[PDB]
């Protein structure tokens, strides 16, 4: 909370375009601290260690995704109090959708809907559930 290090950004997926697509879009909203990981747990791990505020991953089926890694907060409240974001060389709205009612604190797609991805970080940023 005294600087950044309470904000931070994880951009971890299966391929450089998902992640670096994510990675290069979120760079280009004004994260605090981005961190792109192997993949999956690969990156939410490293989120785990270090501080995380908001993960943004691929929807593939890493080591953990959208599910796992809700999944995963649950256990552990510094995540829990972290959102994520799951998207797709497509779109996958049910998908994230699915991590949020799973029981994720607050999952954002990144479909081909600049009005879903868009309103979705409106969401994360303001409109948490």
Not at 37 to 42: H, L, N, R, T
Not at 97 to 116: C, D, R
């Amino acid at each position: 909370m005294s600087l950044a290090e309470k904000i931070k950004v994880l951009i971890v997926d299966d391929q450089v375009t998902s992640r670096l697509l994510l990675g290069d879009a979120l760079q280009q909203l004004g994260f605090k601290q981005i961190t792109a990981a192997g993949d999956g747990e690969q990156g939410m791990k490293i989120m785990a260690q270090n501080p995380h505020h908001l993960v943004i991953s691929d929807f593939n089926m890493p080591k953990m995704d959208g599910l796992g890694l809700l999944q995963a907060v649950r256990a552990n409240p510094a995540t829990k109090k972290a959102a994520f974001i799951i998207l797709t060389a497509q779109g996958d709205r049910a998908l994230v959708q699915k991590a949020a009612a799973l029981g994720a604190n607050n999952v954002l797609a990144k479909p081909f809907t600049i009005e879903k991805m868009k309103a979705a970080i409106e969401a994360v940023f303001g409109a948490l559930k």
